[model samples]
Target chain A: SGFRKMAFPSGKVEGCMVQVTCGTTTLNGLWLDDTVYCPRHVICTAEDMLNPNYEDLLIRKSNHSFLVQAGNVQLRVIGHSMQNCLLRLKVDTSNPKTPKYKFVRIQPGQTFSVLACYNGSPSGVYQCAMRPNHTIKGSFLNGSCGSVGFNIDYDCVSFCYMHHMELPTGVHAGTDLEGKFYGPFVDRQTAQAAGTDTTITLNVLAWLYAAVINGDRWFLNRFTTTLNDFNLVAMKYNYEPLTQDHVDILGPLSAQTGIAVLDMCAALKELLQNGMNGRTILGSTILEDEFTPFDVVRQCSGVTFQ
Target chain B: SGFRKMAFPSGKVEGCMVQVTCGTTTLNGLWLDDTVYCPRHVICTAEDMLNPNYEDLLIRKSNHSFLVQAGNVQLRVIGHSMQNCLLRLKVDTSNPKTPKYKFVRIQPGQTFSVLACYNGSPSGVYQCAMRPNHTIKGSFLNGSCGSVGFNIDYDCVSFCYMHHMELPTGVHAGTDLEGKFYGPFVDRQTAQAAGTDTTITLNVLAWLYAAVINGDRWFLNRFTTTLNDFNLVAMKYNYEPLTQDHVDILGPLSAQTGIAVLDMCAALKELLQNGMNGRTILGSTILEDEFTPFDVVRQCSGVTFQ
Candidate 1:
């Protein structure tokens, strides 16, 4: 047999990422109903948010930070802080089922991922901590503490959340967090000598749009209710009253889905002039997407945290 | 008008059919989650089912019998008997805002559709009906009485139920409809001489798979529970015993999502030759994919008939 010359085409492998997610999908302008199904990937994370439960695992690495999971959301550790020994993600020993997480460390820029599925929580994990390291218990800061006490804005759980109130500017790093809020948030800066990285505000649109996209009525209600409250506030304090029809419609949405949707679209165009930066955008975490939704909430909800 | 060479080009014009719909979607090989969410089209007809406050509406020529919609599904009259009747998709006067419909002619091999939108449904559509034939209050069959009552197998309503009887050959139809159920249904043979065909069998894989794909823990549970119950039955009846590890594991999923899944797969293969045809299926309705959930049961939680 003749030795056939093997044609070796030299080319670097450029791997492209394409995610086929659950929920919304499209193909060639046509949507396919169901020829089959897939194990719920339930992302519990981001844009490629496959969304799921317990499946989201955590990964330990670099000692700088470890990846983790919350719900079905796939999220990134866009920000974190263990200020003054205030390690909030600590295995809140308060719970028994909680496992002691191993090699627990976090960084502002690191990303949390789904790790192995342990039977219990973080506190319960390190029952076999290698040398009782920080993973087994306290201070991811490695016992670093200026004050025994600390405060937080919103406990993003594994993501350490501590930001002091900036009394002077009354604002965190770059965000004034303007606009009506759905529920609670920690938008202020610390007056202390050292505070946390700017409170990483969620691009309201990240969740807002995602919720709508997800058809999560419960979550969508937060935004709807927020919008309603704004109209009420505007009524209480004459902020250029909208048309009576608008009033009749928006009242109570009494702003059901329709009115909420229609008016929001219009307001989006109007609020385009009220530009916000990457730090205060949707992904509120990703800081991408026109997040026209943010504009709707900022304008119509009629309130601003800024 | 010169006599030009007579170009007798002839071809049948398949009349253009234009329809607008919203809700569930599909893609590639998998179903899309939602452009919108709608009640799973679990159609109960006329008085036989008294069913909802609306009727589906549509009928293309020839007997292709196009049953369709988006706010939910295109339900082929799952349970209907058109005996000398024409009940257009009527707005059950039983409802406050429900308007009386008009055209009510229905024949076996004919299409029942969402004829017109009077308002008040998702998409704010009454959807559409063909002709205003019968809008009054009456069984879709114009109150056909055979003494001819209907029968169903499953009751798909609650996890609250606990059935202890696994009667003779479950084999419903021709009747052995025993054991407990979750909800209501009408699985009956027609005595209507020549009644509307019972196309009511569920789209089997439709919502069943969608629910699985959507990771609806609730719907998925029904399956998981069924699996567990079967295992339980076996344990109780001396069919086959599961190991203690199996017991420990199943006990907890006995727990949400995780365990329900792992075990179900094993059970699937184990129960492989477990035979269950149309009579012993999930839709409990043809329970058609409009199961698209127990969707209606799910959506209209605001008002429960049972």
Candidate 2:
């Protein structure tokens, strides 16, 4: 009624591979057919039929051993059956310097258990020779005939797959987190990747840029000119005269003016980045979509008239 | 002819008293009668002179060898003499515990040399001592004379006298100059008789009063209060602040404040005794009268005319 597909590493399906033999001869045909046909299956029967029964698996008496070559390597023994099964292993290799192979035997419903051996030599391979014995039986068929058959197969997959993930983005950003400008640069890069417009990037960048540009002498000269314009605006708010001494001291060397310029630049940057200034760069939208809540009406009098 | 009258310490004379020793077999009655006469008249005739060769006169070994003792003390010998006619001497005394005395001797027409010992102990009560031998000759004599005779009858008038000058009026105030204010006070009479101004007397009274009030607690409270007050004043001038925290942290809590207060009080006492608060206490009149002309005049002209 239902089909299942199992994928594994290539070239592993053969009689030379570990064999899983069923106890009942009727299930052998089912195992060869690789599919089970049930016209109407109950939920419990479906669940039982979906997975192989390990207790019904048996290894053939002829192939009950294994061979191991020297080197660092891993072997996996996979058993699939209709009933409980027994997996036995044996090793044979020529070189005394060759490493013994490590094996992991996995059952249908149980976790795999691994046995490891370290080898003192190099360039050795290992192979499994022992086949698992399994016995298969149907719930309806016990000691008589007229019982449904079940199919089970054994498939083992192995490969030398090594994997590693990239370091966290925050960890990468922390490296340049010292100087004002550098800190913001790193934060902006991280924020862009994290897909969050956390003001962290903008705030950090603004502070850093201000510190750097105001810290430079050449930028300070232009900064003061802009500062005087602001000072003129501030004068409109207050009629206090700028004393001669104040002008003499601050006009020639006013770091405060540079700081003011940096503030203006930071504000402009924030406005531009947020699309508040109606300018769009890259794929960023200048305006966002708006939404309104839909009102639902209920009819109370129509029911009585009907 | 110039006439010279010399005065000597009684010890320097042969009989341990200021006396004119008659060198001739017959007494020079004319020289004795005209004691205030000119040198020519006093030594007018060779028979009237005690030692007329002028050799003894030049060397101060003539009839003019009269010595005058300022007080009861007298010099017994002149051990050595320097270029300015200052003589180092040894004198015999009536007091057995301090029998042998040392002094500096001087002669007429010569200023006494004020040599500082620099290192070792000098033979005197004070570090510097001067003999007004020249004043004796200058006041009585018409001019310079080879040998001078001392007017033994006017010994006190001939020498400058030194006496304790009543501690200069305010030297002993607030200070315990005498050991009176100490010990157990059974009654007001006893306390009054204990002479409270002396340091020992006052401290003893303070202790007794404390015990009468409430043993160590009372004593400590009074002591600390006085000591803290003194310390506060001292700190003001000492360029420091006496914080309660510092006192709380550092203690033998009994007399913490008392120790500081007493120390500062003692310092103030010393400063006052030394007339450090001039013009403030003694007034401008005393300052003007006592001010050394050299200090005022030197500063006025910006030059030391001397």
Candidate 3:
């Protein structure tokens, strides 16, 4: 009787887009559609966050895969899916010596993610709770699914991401740029030295910024890509479709911004298009929307059509 | 007369345009005249790249400065200038222990670049050589300038560089969206993740992509801001005008694609604008018209135009 984001059909996936709110914050700019994303808390202003250069402390697990050979204790994920789901990681004690398991709920369909830096990396026999319920178990993450056990780390190495890029804040205003940058966000050593824990390449930035602009595909890309990837992987192993039952709607981060991701992207996309077109995209527009990145995911399905 | 990029006045310094390139693969894309950029080597393809994470390790010196602390031995410059001048770093063995020195003629304007990744970072009493010259001393660096002392690294930390972005495989003859991504031809991790010493964020990508289109001002923002930054920094310190001294033109990187930095930006810019109007502020286009990042620093005057 009820429609689900995951079971939704292609293009017309029920609510093809959802206003992804973190607690009170409504990433008014983003639309969590057929995608998955790592809602990371990054410095939003033009201010620089990494100073002492801890940026180089990370090591690449594969392409964008980040990890410290022995330390840094960090993890991150990337994936897109057909079904919208929530994930919980059992990052508990692997040593059998102080067997207190660490549990963290990550977004659905993501990988290269560190659930816990604990006991010391890919340790012990780790397991995942698919669509974990907290009330039945009491949780902020509500999803539909099942699970399996694996090294979490050693698997999923060759995975990669793509930027569904488009025109600038002012360029092709009325229309969205039709393609994406099929590559990484950070530069080479820039990427390598940037180290990791939380990726920062184009998709990373687009995803990060998507937290601020939800009007179009950029918002869709990170969330979508992760979702797509995760969903398929879960399916390959015969995992059930992911369904979101509960989200940390009143979480600390979003409650503060009180804005939605979808709103931001749409608002900003139109705002800048207006800047270039000498008009307004909507009745309510953020004054700052005039400045931002690509307008849409133009063929996010492919970087180039020609 | 060998064309000079600008001919304006002082602090109110003029000429906002600049050039960029790859090794030999000219970006017959970008146009610095109406744009700006971060001289980064990003991963460009039809399937945008971002993955394996690794995008979070960078530290920001400024909003765009990507460095870490005490280490990362990297230093990248960002800023186009009103003046075009050359710069020389004293990358020598400041200590008496290892008495060997290795220095390369560096760019005039670039920021937050991870210079050499020593114990891993941009350090070691780095002074400048004001205006370096190779002919006078007969060196590998055939630059028309002077020098200093230092040799900077050990690990994969400190490093430096710039950008030369451009447009699609075709434009104009087709739609306004012909295409604007060109070559550096590298991989692993997405272009964004490859990371950058001088991180450009959206504007960097926009400008890079803009080398292929002229529909927005994002192209102008990053490129202009850094040029301005690069110019003034070089000036306050009394550096010589930066010139296209020695580029790894035929290096394997570009030779594979046959490109250069300046060419990319110019061609892409023109090609995209070709989709619109022609006749730039100037009547005629300069032939072979190639240059790059710090060329505006003959005088690093205005750091702020607002």
Candidate 4:
């Protein structure tokens, strides 16, 4: 017989960070242990997809409790014996006339993500049924038990995407003052490859380049803040955490490039620390022997981490 | 004997558009027919070169009369008989420790430009002496007469460069629907070559791509507005004006790309029209037989126009 709770336990719900990727763009959102508290329906409609500050609308909604933080939109669900909740993300990619929609069922603890490949193919948990249509529906099987006994092994993949960001290339290398070779990458292949090779460390560096060096600094503050949830979520999934080694390695390299690089390194270091204590208090440390190995989400899909 | 006016004309001085190129980066400034009025020394010092909004400092200075418009900085001169003026531009390219300075002797009607090629060579009116140091000194032969009679024929070349912007390539071609190819470039060589091949039309398209499609729209409104002075100056030189031919060709291509493209095309058409009537009133039209042939300033250094 399956164990089930007649009455739900009342407690504060913590949000698990999740993100939906549409082509090259990703929108960060959170998944909550909604088995005890039913999740509400919330839609983050974009008035102008072209507005760089269109997310400000989501931030404004955050103030009204649609989201707990400006960085990540919130999604949660709860019930007496079982929990069921749905989140619908709809967007017009380039052609407004033909809009795309994807529905995702909220699962507790496990992080769910939707990768929209556009003309490309998906990798890792972003499995493709390869229908004629690009849009895919995301779902998960439920356990007939309370939050404590619920199965956390559900596939954390969903569908539907809205924007695109071309990843930078020929990064990670530069000439040193002494005329000696100095760079982060060991070879051209490592520097240019994509997928799991694009680590969290390299992702942060690329973002730093985009924000600081590329004169797109306006978005950096909010983006780095959002990575806090990113790091926290990665920790819960037993992925490698951002350590001092990563920061130190990037520090001198960034400094050698420009003062702006130093500025980003300093800010990135501070933001990465935000996740350290938060993950510790949540006791997310796990043994590899106990859980299945998981792949880390590539912040960018087309550049090597080095 | 040449007639020289003892007293300078006291009427308001009009500014001619002038821009200094430090590799790919260009700072737009104005050149007043300063032959009648001796110009003042005003430097737009960059507090942080890496700041995307570093020009805002100049804008603040503009409020104090250092510049005439936020889109273009002010430069003018007034004197009794012969006017002599100096405008010094000093900057740190990448290494802050080694700063470069260039002195420009402003010419009345002839536009002076300083093209700093860090590794490459110069072309067109940007004649190079091939000095060991990339920096070049810019000078102009003077005219004894006041603003109205000054020799407009002077070498409009100067030296000292501080930044670099890599020109975009393969930007002028795209596959159209109905199994046809439609774009701005005639061929790959036309699309990739620098100098004259990169026309004002293609430059605007590239800027539009950077601002609207690539999500860097914050700088577009001011940038396109500044092009008014650009077009006005080009008209004064009898260069081929941004005709209806240019605008019409771009409109269809832009609309087919995205809604953002249509938005940019609309704004560009309006901005281009600003010069039409202004140039007409100034009586700047000239037959090819009347004046020496001159090259139009490439809005972008690379990419070919249709």
Candidate 5:
């Protein structure tokens, strides 16, 4: 015996999106359900027709702040990659010029747990900004100026990625060049303050670089270790809200002292980014196509020696 | 477009049941594939089919204790009524006399953990026995005088489906009785030695029970509590191999206080079981089934009972 196909009853869509536009202000969208419809034809004799498209959208406008319901909203970093990304909650009612904002810098992969208050207004729309050490420009929306722009020049690439390219020896030959132009900053301010000699400072800086690099390395290697410990601790305490003291002691200690410590971690991230960019360029043949040996030589020869 | 039927491959039926005829042993079962065929019309086409039913059924037998390796086996239990039910694990070996066995007792409505080690075997052939009290009596294996059988019986029915029946009267009934009975045995031996009539003894026992139940309850209620504190402790502490100091304290307590606790729990279990049984008998009469007459009888038969 052959099996029969099963058919299910279809439900009628009964909602309408009401769009309310606010001139030069905020717009709100409200969803409505009550509506009336007439049957066009009989079931068996009716010809098949295209389904009607009804966009169930809503728009509302009010003097008060726009309240977006709390939901799973994906925050994507658009132009530049962000590290040590901070999320700030700002209230701009009193002095619209200077908004009251709380800056919370989250680690690369961390998520913020927002509490429900003020009608789930998302704390505030987060502006993706890079750390000061980052060479790439940050992007921000300007409501006051009515303009959105990047903080840095579009041509500028990430320093970590640029480090791998075999550029001329004095590529960053300028008096006002930042320390990162040479490479990562290292010398401890405290050690420098102790009236150390130039040679000693240089040695200390080298040691500091080694220390920082080593710390990064340790962190990278022990990523699983620290995470496992954190998980075990969470289970042991039944995921109790960790005290500040607990975080203060365990967090840094775990990051710094492990076999695969912090310096290696930073180096790994830098190397990974560099390698990714190199692979992308190489695979795309962009560098080979744009910059030939002759073009490089012409550019280098055209520049006069300082 | 015409619809097509979804098809699945037919499952094979490999008929074999393990029959143990001897001492404590473990048996492993595994399935292997072969392509042997016989004519469809033949009644006993194969030599194996003509053999005795028991001979064909018995797979293998072992004499000594060993771990059985069996793939996941699914077993189901159906109760005729809420009475003590026993699920016996059958082991096949030589010399059935003086057969040593271990078994787990599951109460009514209580499900045992799957893939569990019960009765010294890991092949997952578990015997489930239900009783009102968490106590078991050893009976001689049927027609096998020297062999002993293990069964679990508890004082009260752990679960009930009767609608009008009240919840079990006391807190110390069913699964709760085990902790109440065993907890005092472990904690308040000195108090038990002094006797229940003594104020100090009763207070100490009460404190111990409170500590056992409440301490466990508090820890369980917290989100941070882990198996490390409970299961790991059980594994490491070896409650069975407790020292003399422990026994000196636990023995009298187990004897005196445990007995009382067990009796009270038993009484509560009996009350619930009787109530359930009465409700079941009352269910036969269609009109009277919906309401409980027990409370009415208690109220009306008394001189001035409330």
Candidate 6:
């Protein structure tokens, strides 16, 4: 008996790892459509096949190799140290009290779809492994993982969000914040999407607009310290802008609030740039790695403003 | 030409420490009407006052004796270790950049009047001596220092506040926040004035109200992280109550925003109480001792809202 692909008209072809009889099966890159294309006898050792719970999984690609959760069996393909290799790190969640074993690699500039958890869905934490020894954790909402980037060592944890302004259609249906933004936007390509110069300003505006309309205080409270600190910095440094148009839209929110938000976004973006690899910046304040949940989109609701 | 009170019916009498020639001068308690009442010769030794730079200054008040800044001149009055004695600490300010020499003692339950620095006056920091060897510092605005209380060991540093609602009359003319609130209220009697139970709620409301009206983004930013962290905590703990009235006054602001404010204040009050002795709690989020400039009334404007 061997691991096989699901039968019947499964509509589309999906990738899944299938365990086969132990032999010289040289499983190279990621699996494709229920097949383990191994050219050489890699898994032939008696000890390798016997100890089922070896507690180690290998990731082999080009000059890179990853062995997650070391045990008695330490398999080496190219003799690369585990220190530099990536590991299939287990993710520990916060709200639902569950540990995730499955992780899909998200490519650079792409966001994980947070299509499932919606409407007051539980949001929580995701602890991902950076190095075999180090695990970085951040908050996430809805369902989904983080986005990926250049300095980002991990993937994005996407989460479902409430529709605010205009509901996203097509591929980004229900995901794009254009519909309504309740928290910080986690788009890795935000700067590219909107001019880098005005990216932060717009993001801050989006959040402010979403928050005011939705009255989402959770969105407001979570980053109060970060916002406040940045506000002080903005004033001390005289950070500017929040044009007449910006003020007009805000109505009674005040230009100061908009300016503070603008400063906060700019400061946070800079903070993330300064501390590479999604590290929590400024201590207890909300700023952290650009991809971390709070650092990015923060958690949002799937239910649009009522 | 001895240390004498300024002549010419100088209106009213004010207290000030005056240096006197030491031989057999017995200085017991605080000086009064330019008179040193000493029954015995307390300063008779040649080494007593010879080492003029004997950094240590003794405070003899019954069981408590403070010898600030130790030097070769230990000057033990009541055999109390330096650890227990109070020390005269030098304050380091942020803006205007200067070291304060004279520190007036503010009694408990009273605020230090910040009268001078008005109309966009420079606001900074205050580092006050907590123990003989330790110093605690916090932010400040307008002119004054922190407020004092039972748990608070130091005296209040009152500052001037811009007249808001009804201008404070008589003695409180430019000092009371009643005229208008901008930041957190630093009144040590905040809890007492608003009643213990609803104290936090009202304080938070007052801050929100002040911030909105004054458009004080600094007030908003400084405590963002704290507010956000507390927001998450509040959600997890199911902390409730923003009241119908609270939302009504906020007008354009959502009930969620008010709720978050309520939770933030309650959480902050608890955080301060938990870590007594005016310690910074929850890291960089801005919650600290009740008197720390940010912890109490965040630096506010002396200029009333336009």
Q: Which stretches of candidate 5 lie above 4 Å from their native place?
A: A1-21, A24-306, B1-306
Q: What share of the true interface contacts does each candidate keep?
A: 0.00, 0.00, 0.00, 0.00, 0.00, 0.01
Candidate 2, residue A243: how far the Cα is off, in Å: 89
Ranking by TM-score: 3, 4, 6, 1, 5, 2
Candidate 6 regions with alpha-carbon error over 4 angstroms:
A1-203, A216-306, B1-306
Query: What lDDT score is found at residue A245 in candidate 4?
Result: 49
RMSD of each: 26.6, 53.2, 26.3, 29.8, 37.4, 28.9
What lDDT tens digits, residue by residue, belong to model 4 across residues B55-166?
A: 3433343312322221233323211211112222221212121112222332111222222111111100111111111111221111100111111122221221211112
Query: Highest TM-score: which candidate?
Result: 3
Candidate 4 - CAPRI tier? Answer: incorrect
Better of 3 and 6 by lDDT: 6
Per-residue CA lDDT of model 2 for A1-306, tens digit only, reads: 000011111111111121111222111000112211111111112234445332321232222222111223322222222211112223222223222222233211111100001121100011111101111100111111111111112222221110001112211111100111112222121223322221112222222222232222221122223444434543443322233333333221224333443344333334333434433211112211110000000101111111
What C-alpha lDDT do the candidate models reach, one value each? 0.21, 0.20, 0.20, 0.25, 0.19, 0.24
lDDT of 2 by residue, B106-154 (tens): 2211221110010111110111111111111011011111121211222
Candidate 5, residues A95-144, lDDT tens digits: the string is 21221222222221111111101111111111121212221111111111
Residue runs of model 1 more than 4 Å from their true location after superposition: A1-249, A252-306, B1-62, B65-184, B187-247, B250-306
Supply DockQ values for each candidate.
Answer: 0.02, 0.00, 0.01, 0.01, 0.01, 0.01
Candidate 2 regions exceeding 4 Å error are A1-306, B1-75, B80-88, B92-230, B233-306
Deviation (Å) of B173 in candidate 2: 15
Which lDDT value does model 6 have at B64? 28
The Cα RMSD across the true interface for model 1 is 38.3
